[PDB]
Amino acid sequence: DDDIAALVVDNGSGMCKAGFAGDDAPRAVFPSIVGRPRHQGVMVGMGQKDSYVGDEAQSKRGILTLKYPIEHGIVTNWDDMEKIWHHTFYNELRVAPEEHPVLLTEAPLNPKANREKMTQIMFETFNTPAMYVAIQAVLSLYASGRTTGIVMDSGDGVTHTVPIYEGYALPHAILRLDLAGRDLTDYLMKILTERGYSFTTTAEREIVRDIKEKLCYVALDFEQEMATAASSSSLEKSYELPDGQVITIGNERFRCPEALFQPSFLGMESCGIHETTFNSIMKCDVDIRKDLYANTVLSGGTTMYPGIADRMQKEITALAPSTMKIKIIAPPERKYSVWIGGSILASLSTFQQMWISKQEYDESGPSIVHRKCF
Amino acid sequence: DDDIAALVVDNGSGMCKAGFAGDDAPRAVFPSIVGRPRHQGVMVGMGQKDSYVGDEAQSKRGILTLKYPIEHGIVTNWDDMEKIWHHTFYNELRVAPEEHPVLLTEAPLNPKANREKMTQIMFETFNTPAMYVAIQAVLSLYASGRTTGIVMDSGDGVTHTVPIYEGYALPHAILRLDLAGRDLTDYLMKILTERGYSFTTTAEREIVRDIKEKLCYVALDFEQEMATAASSSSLEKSYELPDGQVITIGNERFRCPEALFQPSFLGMESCGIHETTFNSIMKCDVDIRKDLYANTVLSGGTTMYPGIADRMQKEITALAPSTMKIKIIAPPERKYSVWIGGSILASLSTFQQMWISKQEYDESGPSIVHRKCF
Amino acid sequence: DDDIAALVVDNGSGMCKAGFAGDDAPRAVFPSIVGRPRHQGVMVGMGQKDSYVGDEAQSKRGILTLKYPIEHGIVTNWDDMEKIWHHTFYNELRVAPEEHPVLLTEAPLNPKANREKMTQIMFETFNTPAMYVAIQAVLSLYASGRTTGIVMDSGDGVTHTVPIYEGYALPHAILRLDLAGRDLTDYLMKILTERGYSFTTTAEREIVRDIKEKLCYVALDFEQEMATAASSSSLEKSYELPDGQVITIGNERFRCPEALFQPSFLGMESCGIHETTFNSIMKCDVDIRKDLYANTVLSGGTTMYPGIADRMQKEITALAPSTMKIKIIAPPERKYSVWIGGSILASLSTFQQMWISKQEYDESGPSIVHRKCF
Amino acid sequence: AWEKQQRKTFTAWCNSHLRKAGTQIENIEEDFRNGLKLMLLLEVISGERLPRPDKGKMRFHKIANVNKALDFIASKGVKLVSIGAEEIVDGNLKMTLGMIWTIILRFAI
């Protein structure tokens, strides 16, 4: 009852949501550091201010030293992620880390050393009684009104297809794809800069994140969609820089999410997302497959694109035996699923025998995350 | 009168029928377990559901631990058969095992240790006042309008030819063949997978059971039937996977039941079914043989194949002396015979001196089933 | 005498060996295409070169169009296999296809349509007087100093267990397993990429083939071998990329071939190799079984793993009756067996009545391969 | 027909015990979905204490409480056959009636 309850921290590429297990919604949802000049600074349109905080320190990050990011969905910057977490506990939830276990979420296919560095920080730097790291798509599944199915979870740093039989993920048939939201923000900026555009100043590297999320679309037929970019009129939309300037985007809007279906666009040998759902399904028990096609659920920020349910359906319908009823499920809130699946999970008395404890971390070191978190 | 009456439990490979002795039809007929993940599970298209029940647990059986099958007609999985029986008493008939004797049926030629394990379970695990195990074909015979004859009983785990003189099976001339419905589901899947088909996921191992039962046929002349597969047009039929996909079956449909007549197809040295009826008849009293040819009755799920009466007739007519009137009998309900033969039998006051009692089981152990059940 | 003699072509996943029937060793052994840019190409560190040949065209295969692979042991790419064969005749043996019959070998359990496409190509595209397709393990057997026995043949696309009585394969007891060398190169790359490794560029997809063949091992006791990976020191070995970079492999080395014994590792329901030898033996004549246990011969590239003779012995010794003398035979050249078994066979006057002739192919079409090649 | 009968009898039976805890159920296919009275029923007939209920009305809260009951039963040497909390939470009739019989048989017969 409140003071004591694990804190669920969901670490998204664009957004972080943090709260208390047993709760219905995130108490703190925030944009995803303190930066001191490390050279006596101050613009003369500010006081002798030598700690810039939050976003007014993102846009001088290059000229400043930052004390604590997410892009492997994956964390590229570890002291600025450390900052975010310190702010989660000490300023947003107003909590003490050494009295609450934390469930941190992580990207599908998150790199080895990342899992260990977040075990590391959490234990040594925040002195956490216990912790667990769950993949985000698996908490989307547990939080739904379903028990058998396969979730396709696409966050910022990973994508996984997870077959679940009766609330239990089937680890042999889980498949990880290292292409998710950051890969798509990045590829958008390159096709936009290829059109001779200029995203030259820090804040504005984060301005492709809003075009991506605001104007991208998934095409039903990429091919007839590209010539339904050449029959223009209605496809170009404009985006306004902070600078006052204008952007115009056309074939790019649908060409961005297409790297999910065809990762050759990104220079990757990987199958796209539609084939990976199908190849996990083929790895499962012959007698649950029909259940897994009827319950394909999408979860995660990168599944929010207009057209992705239809195009996922169209594509699984082409690979699937000529009879399967294929029901792709794309609940419109596929906005807080990862956080309320973790809030459920970390509240069950079940879960306390599932954490990695302070004791165990000493015993083993950081490696133990690989053993216990699957 | 109801509360007290033995419960007849007929244990079929595809179907179980259970009821009360003295009754006309089975009260519970059902498809032939509770499965808990034994690793915190749940698909995110289900609640945190960690007991899957029935068939949604068959199709994750491989990823789950199941608490209680039939294939020696024979039981291959003992805790999932234990589950079925618990569900028979406690959920289907809504009965208490320690107040009712049970007649359980069993395959012709059922392995020794199987008879003992079902004596074992029934007494120690369900604390049964008494029990008897009857072969299925022999209850098909007792339930018919006949008293002298020979039954050919083909279930899931065994086949027997039983000569009966005046309601009494003649144990010396009884012959057991360990090839029945499971042998034929299995051989169908191998000839179908040999055609490069894929029955890779659990539920779909049970999908050969429906092709087998839905499309198989017994050929009159296998030989002229195989070239009346090469003069195709009308022989291939299609089956639809849950997966949406298509199956096409042709020479396979009649080549499956043919393993009954020629068990060389299965890699077995055994005579087929037509020779075994003839070799029991030759072992009987010289003065009832003419009665046994006039009353050849088929009973059991594996006798349901189109063409089996005609082909049994054609074949016994070739081995039989050139004069015998041979009348093969194949009553169209050869669907509930095993259960109503047991319901008759376990209702006669005759039968209470025929059971193995709790007392006797203590006295002897599980072995006693061999003594008293023939 | 030379000009006239069939050409034996053995089509391996890693290596092809081609020669003339009646000869002791392969005349051409080579690595297993001409690629023209189909977009005016040339690196400026090469002439205007628009046909890359061999392996310098494998590593731009993705950017080039290739005119003629093996992985169903199975052929995944038909025009690049066509290339290989054209090079076999016209550049390696310096032969004319329309004057020599060819014996092509094939994987145990090779898909239907594959057998037909290689009948197809050979007749229509190379205008072959005649041809035969033999399974590779069966020519390993004929080429040995033995006449009764069972061979376990594991190539690139299939594995079969073949019982042979007096030089004659017993087709009912032959069992096919579709898991061989390609399945193991593939599973190695996934467990290596799971360790966050990167086999991202074409040539280097073929660099897992050399780790697999160079460092893999078969464990005697997988279980005590895995904790004799955790008592490391001596188990990790390193592999060097072309790129200059390093690989380190540890538990993976023995975990790769283990998918042969436990195909659950691969997500397959199949029995492993040790059970399939035992289930062919049980399907044979009661009076040759003792001969088949005393003469278990392994043949094929996937049988080359250190520890496979011992582990095959240990495992057949556990299933086999408690008395059988079990002699597993693993001749150290189990390097050219498939080719010299075919060279013997296609030189006997026996064999000319065994081919599929140009005439017959016309008569029947490509289907005839199924009739005549077993 | 058995379904309608079993529902009436099982409901009356459950109620004859729950009344000692000052409650009752009306529709068996609804009133056990959240697992509260299911847990209450088990403590009443066994005279033992089950784990404390989870506070909340969400689906996952129900699964958790129904699982407390299901586990308690299983711990009494009962084999919940294909009976999972999901079906109970979902108000599945066959599964619910199957569960109650299992309890009637185990704790009263």
User: How far apart are the C-alpha atoms of A297 and A280, rounded to whole Å?
Assistant: 14
User: How far apart are the C-alpha atoms of C171 and C161, rounded to whole Å?
Assistant: 10
Q: What HEC string does chain D produce?
A: CHHHHHHHHHHHHHHHHHHHHCCCCCCCCCCCCCCHHHHHHHHHHHCCCCCCCCCCCCHHHHHHHHHHHHHHHHCCCCCCCCCCHHHHHCCCHHHHHHHHHHHHHHHHC
Nearest to A214 by CA among A179, A187, A238: A238
Q: Which chain C residues have a beta carbon less than 8 Å from that of B267? A: 172-173, 282-283
CA–CA distance from C312 to each of B88, C195, C222, C293 (Å)? 45, 29, 13, 12
Q: Are residues A125 and A264 in the same domain?
A: no
Nearest to B339 by CA among B13, B3, B25: B25
Cβ neighbours for C124, distance < 8 A, ≥ 6 positions apart: none
DSSP notation for B64-107: SEEE--B----B--HHHHHHHHHHIIIIII---GGGS-EEEEE-
Helix (H) or strand (E) holding B358: helix B358-364
For chain D, the first-to-last Cα distance in angstroms comes to 24
Q: Check if the beta carbon of residue B132 is closer than 8 Å to that of residue B354.
A: yes
For chain B, the first-to-last Cα distance in angstroms comes to 28
User: How far apart are the C-alpha atoms of B122 and B131, rounded to whole Å?
Assistant: 8
CA B352 to chain CA mean position, Å: 25
Q: Are residues A352 and A310 in the same domain?
A: no
The token duo for C104 is: 């092509």
CA–CA distance from C304 to each of A75, A276, B366, C335, D2 (Å)? 43, 33, 50, 9, 65
Q: Check if the beta carbon of residue A74 is closer than 8 Å to that of residue A158.
A: yes
Q: Are residues C84 and C160 in the same domain?
A: no
Rg (chain D; Cα; Å): 13
Residues of B with CB under 8 A from a CB of A: 35, 37, 39-52, 55-64, 199-207, 240-246
Buried b (16+ CB within 10 A) or exposed e, C171-181: eebbbbbbbbb
Cβ neighbours for B115, distance < 8 A, ≥ 6 positions apart: B106, B133, B369, B370, B373
Residue contact A173–C200, C-beta within 8 A: no
Q: Which chain C residues have a beta carbon less than 8 Å from that of A172? A: 264, 267
Q: Which chain A residues have a beta carbon less than 8 Å from that of B205? A: 286-287
**How close is the nearest chain B Cα to the Cα of C137, in Å?**
19
Place of tokens 């396979």: B252
Q: Check if the beta carbon of residue C353 is closer than 8 Å to that of residue C147.
A: no
Cβ neighbours for B100, distance < 8 A, ≥ 6 positions apart: B4, B5, B6, B7, B128, B129
The token duo for A257 is: 């999410």
Residue contact A269–C200, C-beta within 8 A: yes
Q: Are residues A9 and A90 in the same domain?
A: yes
Closest residue, chain C, to B202 (C-alpha): C269
User: How far apart are the C-alpha atoms of B29 and C280, rounded to whole Å?
Assistant: 39
DSSP notation for C111-163: -HHHHHHHHHIIIIIT--SEEEEEEHHHHHHHHSS-SSEEEEEE-SS-EEEEE
A320 burial level (CB within 10 Å; 0-12, 13-18, 19+): buried
Cβ neighbours for C24, distance < 8 A, ≥ 6 positions apart: C340, C343
Q: Are residues A117 and A221 in the same domain?
A: no
Selected for mutation to probe chain C from A114, A158, A170, A172 (highest C CB count within 10 Å) is: A172
Buried b (16+ CB within 10 A) or exposed e, D48-74: eebeebbebebbbbbbbbbbbbbbbbb
C and D: touch, per 3+ CB pairs < 8 A? no
Looking at residue A206, its amino acid is: E
The token duo for B184 is: 């034929």
Residue contact A286–C267, C-beta within 8 A: no
User: How far apart are the C-alpha atoms of A338 and A142, rounded to whole Å?
Assistant: 9
User: How far apart are the C-alpha atoms of C64 and A109, rounded to whole Å?
Assistant: 32
φ and ψ at residue A235, rounded to 5 degrees: -90, -30
Q: Which chain B residues have a beta carbon less than 8 Å from that of D69? A: none
Looking at residue A219, its amino acid is: A
CATH number at residue C121: 3.30.420.40
Q: Which chain C residues have a beta carbon less than 8 Å from that of B264? A: 172
Nearest to C298 by CA among C274, C257, C334: C334
Residue contact C195–A112, C-beta within 8 A: yes
Cβ neighbours for A113, distance < 8 A, ≥ 6 positions apart: C196
Residues of B with CB under 8 A from a CB of C: 195-196, 200, 264, 267, 269
CA B237 to chain CA mean position, Å: 26
Q: What HEC string does A18-81 produce?
A: EEECCCCCCCEEEECCEEECCCCCCCCCCCCCCCEEHHHHHHHCCCCEEECCECCCCECCHHHH
The SS3 of residue C23 is coil
Q: Check if the beta carbon of residue B127 is closer than 8 Å to that of residue B121.
A: no
The SS3 of residue B357 is strand
The SS3 of residue C67 is strand
Q: What HEC string does C187-247 produce?
A: HHHHHHHHCCCCCCCHHHHCHHHHHHHHHCCCCCCHHHHHHHHHCCCCCCEEEECCCCCEE
Total domains present in chain C: 3
CA–CA distance from B93 to each of A89, B17, B96, C250 (Å)? 57, 11, 9, 57
User: How far apart are the C-alpha atoms of C54 and C34, rounded to whole Å?
Assistant: 7
Residue contact D56–A22, C-beta within 8 A: yes
Q: How many CB atoms lie within 10 A of CB C293?
A: 23
φ and ψ at residue D28, rounded to 5 degrees: -55, -30
Residue contact D60–A142, C-beta within 8 A: yes
User: How far apart are the C-alpha atoms of A50 and A113, rounded to whole Å?
Assistant: 34
Looking at residue C278, its amino acid is: F
User: How far apart are the C-alpha atoms of C107 and C116, rounded to whole Å?
Assistant: 14
Cβ neighbours for C227, distance < 8 A, ≥ 6 positions apart: none
Place of tokens 């068990």: B263
**Structural domain boundaries enclosing B327:** 137-178+272-337
The SS3 of residue B46 is strand
Rg (chain B; Cα; Å): 22
CA angle C145, C149, C150 (to 5 degrees): 120
Residue contact B67–D67, C-beta within 8 A: no
Residue contact B43–A285, C-beta within 8 A: no
User: How far apart are the C-alpha atoms of C257 and B316, rounded to whole Å?
Assistant: 53
User: How far apart are the C-alpha atoms of A25 and A343, rounded to whole Å?
Assistant: 9
User: How far apart are the C-alpha atoms of B351 and B344, rounded to whole Å?
Assistant: 10
The dihedral sign for the CA sequence C78, C79, C80, C86: positive
Q: Are residues C164 and C300 in the same domain?
A: yes
Nearest to A301 by CA among A209, A167, A222, A221: A209
CA C351 to chain CA mean position, Å: 23
Give residues 65 to 94 of B whose Cβ lies within 8 Å of D. 67-68, 82-84, 86-87, 89-91, 94
Q: How many CB atoms lie within 10 A of CB C252?
A: 22
User: How far apart are the C-alpha atoms of C203 and C188, rounded to whole Å?
Assistant: 16
Q: What is the resolution of this structure in A?
A: 15.0
DSSP state of B45: B
User: How far apart are the C-alpha atoms of B57 and C349, rounded to whole Å?
Assistant: 60
Chain B CB within 8 Å of residue D105 CB: yes
Residue contact D64–B48, C-beta within 8 A: yes
Q: Are residues C132 and C172 in the same domain?
A: no
Chains touching C by CB (3 or more pairs below 8 Å): A, B
Cβ neighbours for C107, distance < 8 A, ≥ 6 positions apart: C72, C73, C74, C135, C136, C155, C156, C157, C158, C180
DSSP notation for B159-208: EEEEEEETTEE-GGG-EEES-SHHHHHHHHHHHHHHTS----BGGGGSHH
Residues of C with CB under 8 A from a CB of B: 111-113, 172-173, 268-269, 282-283, 286
CA–CA distance from A129 to each of A121, A360, A361, B116 (Å)? 13, 10, 10, 54
Q: Which chain D residues have a beta carbon less than 8 Å from that of B36? A: 80, 84
Q: Are residues C86 and C185 in the same domain?
A: no
Cβ neighbours for D53, distance < 8 A, ≥ 6 positions apart: D35, D36, D39, D65, D68
Looking at residue B77, its amino acid is: N
Residue contact B35–D79, C-beta within 8 A: no
The token duo for C363 is: 């008569």
Place of tokens 């008939």: B93
The dihedral sign for the CA sequence C297, C303, C304, C309: negative
Buried b (16+ CB within 10 A) or exposed e, A114-151: bbbbbbbbbbeebebbbbbbbbbbbbbbbbbebbbbbb
User: How far apart are the C-alpha atoms of C204 and C186, rounded to whole Å?
Assistant: 12
DSSP state of B303: G
Cβ neighbours for C332, distance < 8 A, ≥ 6 positions apart: none
Write down which residue in A220, A249, A271 finishes a domain: A271
The SS3 of residue C44 is coil
User: How far apart are the C-alpha atoms of B254 and B232, rounded to whole Å?
Assistant: 14
Q: Which residues pair with C106 in a beta bridge?
A: C135
Selected for mutation to probe chain C from B191, B195, B200, B202 (highest C CB count within 10 Å) is: B200
Q: Are residues A192 and A307 in the same domain?
A: no
Residue contact B62–A144, C-beta within 8 A: no
The token duo for A133 is: 């790291």
User: How far apart are the C-alpha atoms of B65 and B78, rounded to whole Å?
Assistant: 13
Cβ neighbours for A31, distance < 8 A, ≥ 6 positions apart: A14, A15, A16, A55
Write down which residue in B224, B255, B271 finishes a domain: B271
The closest CB to that of A147, out of B46, B240, B241, belongs to B46
Selected for mutation to probe chain B from C269, C364, C370 (highest B CB count within 10 Å) is: C269
CA A274 to chain CA mean position, Å: 19
CA A178 to chain CA mean position, Å: 11
**How close is the nearest chain D Cα to the Cα of A309, in Å?**
25
Q: Are residues B286 and B165 in the same domain?
A: yes
Residues after which chain A has a gap (C–N > 2.5 Å):
32, 68, 71, 72, 334
Q: Check if the beta carbon of residue B211 is closer than 8 Å to that of residue B192.
A: yes
User: In terms of residues, how long is chain A?
Assistant: 374
C234 burial level (CB within 10 Å; 0-12, 13-18, 19+): exposed
Q: Check if the beta carbon of residue C284 is closer than 8 Å to that of residue C171.
A: no
**How close is the nearest chain C Cα to the Cα of A191, in Å?**
21
CA A295 to chain CA mean position, Å: 22
Cβ neighbours for C261, distance < 8 A, ≥ 6 positions apart: C218, C222, C272, C273, C274, C311, C315
CATH number at residue B209: 3.90.640.10
Residue contact A321–B49, C-beta within 8 A: no
Selected for mutation to probe chain A from B34, B38, B40, B44 (highest A CB count within 10 Å) is: B44
Write down which residue in B226, B249, B271 finishes a domain: B271
Helix (H) or strand (E) holding A276: helix A273-281
Q: How many CB atoms lie within 10 A of CB C372?
A: 15
Q: How many CB atoms lie within 10 A of CB A282?
A: 17
Looking at residue D93, its amino acid is: L
User: How far apart are the C-alpha atoms of B158 and C272, rounded to whole Å?
Assistant: 29
Q: Check if the beta carbon of residue B237 is closer than 8 Å to that of residue B251.
A: no
Sequence-ordered strand ranges (E) for chain A: 7-11, 15-20, 28-31, 34-36, 52-53, 65-67, 102-106, 130-135, 149-154, 159-165, 168-169, 175-177, 237-240, 246-249, 296-299, 328-329, 356-357
The closest CB to that of A166, out of B52, B245, B246, belongs to B52
CA angle A278, A280, A283 (to 5 degrees): 115
Rg (chain A; Cα; Å): 22
Residue contact C195–A283, C-beta within 8 A: no
Q: Which residues pair with A135 in a beta bridge?
A: A106
User: How far apart are the C-alpha atoms of C112 and B197, rounded to whole Å?
Assistant: 11
CA–CA distance from C236 to each of C229, C251, D91 (Å)? 8, 8, 55
The token duo for C173 is: 């007891």
Pair type for strands A159-165 and A149-154: antiparallel
The token duo for C141 is: 């057997």
Q: Check if the beta carbon of residue A273 is closer than 8 Å to that of residue A299.
A: no
Looking at residue B138, its amino acid is: V
Nearest to C85 by CA among C144, C136, C131: C131
Q: Check if the beta carbon of residue A122 is closer than 8 Å to that of residue A128.
A: yes
Q: Are residues C13 and C108 in the same domain?
A: yes
Q: Which chain B residues have a beta carbon less than 8 Å from that of D6? A: 94
Q: Which chain D residues have a beta carbon less than 8 Å from that of B56? A: 82
Place of tokens 């847990």: D39
Q: Are residues B190 and B224 in the same domain?
A: yes
Residue contact D84–A147, C-beta within 8 A: yes
Buried b (16+ CB within 10 A) or exposed e, A33-53: bbbeeeeebeeeeeeeeeebe
CA–CA distance from C273 to each of B371, C162, C276 (Å)? 42, 12, 5
